[PDB]
Design a protein around this ligand. Structure first.
Ligand code: HEM
Length: 154
């Protein structure tokens, strides 16, 4: 699949807002993910002990992790589709070291959309959300293709 320049512009416009506070967006996204799909928390040995949202918000390590994840996702989005190089190491670590099913990538994509919708309604209308969903589906499609090449079905 391919996004038009117009769709990329909608994606990058709202992402520019996210970049005004990466750490804050990272926390909301992971808390949303862990609360909506608790099973995903079991994949993080470093955070699986967190019991409440209060504990999650207070975790310095979780906040730092969120910045690392969003920064990588941002680098990929800014390539506007030409992200083959950025995807390689990401796909290998998540398929071989962390063992993350495509299903879980769908869950975090939902968390991202939810948080952007909550925080940036003025820059995340129907068209912009459609553009973001398309960019995330492209991301998941390409990561899935790499998973297969690497020998991981998940
Ligand atoms: C938006 C998609 C995602 C991106 C861009 C992303 C990015 C990253 C990055 C950059 C790291 C650190 C470097 C590395 O280990 O490769 C990381 C670590 C990790 N990711 Fe992801 N990730 C994504 C989705 C997920 C999902 C959905 C899970 C599973 C619920 C997951 C589980 C992990 C784990 C377990 C680690 C190691 C954390 C640690 O022990 O420090 N990731 N991810």
């Amino acid at each position: 699949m391919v996004l038009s320049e117009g769709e990329w512009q909608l994606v990058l416009h709202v992402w520019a807002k996210v970049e005004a506070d990466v750490a804050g967006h990272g926390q909301d996204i992971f808390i949303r993910l862990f609360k909506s799909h608790p099973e995903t928390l079991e994949k993080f040995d470093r955070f699986k002990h967190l019991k409440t949202e209060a504990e999650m918000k207070a975790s310095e390590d979780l906040k730092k992790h969120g910045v690392t994840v969003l920064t990588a996702l941002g680098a990929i989005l800014k390539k506007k589709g030409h992200h083959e190089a950025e995807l390689k190491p990401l796909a290998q670590s998540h398929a071989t070291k962390h063992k993350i099913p495509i299903k879980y990538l769908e869950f975090i994509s939902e968390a991202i959309i939810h948080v952007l919708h909550s925080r940036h309604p003025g820059n995340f209308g129907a068209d912009a959300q459609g553009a973001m969903n398309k960019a995330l589906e492209l991301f998941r499609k390409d990561i899935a293709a790499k998973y297969k090449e690497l020998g991981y079905q998940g």
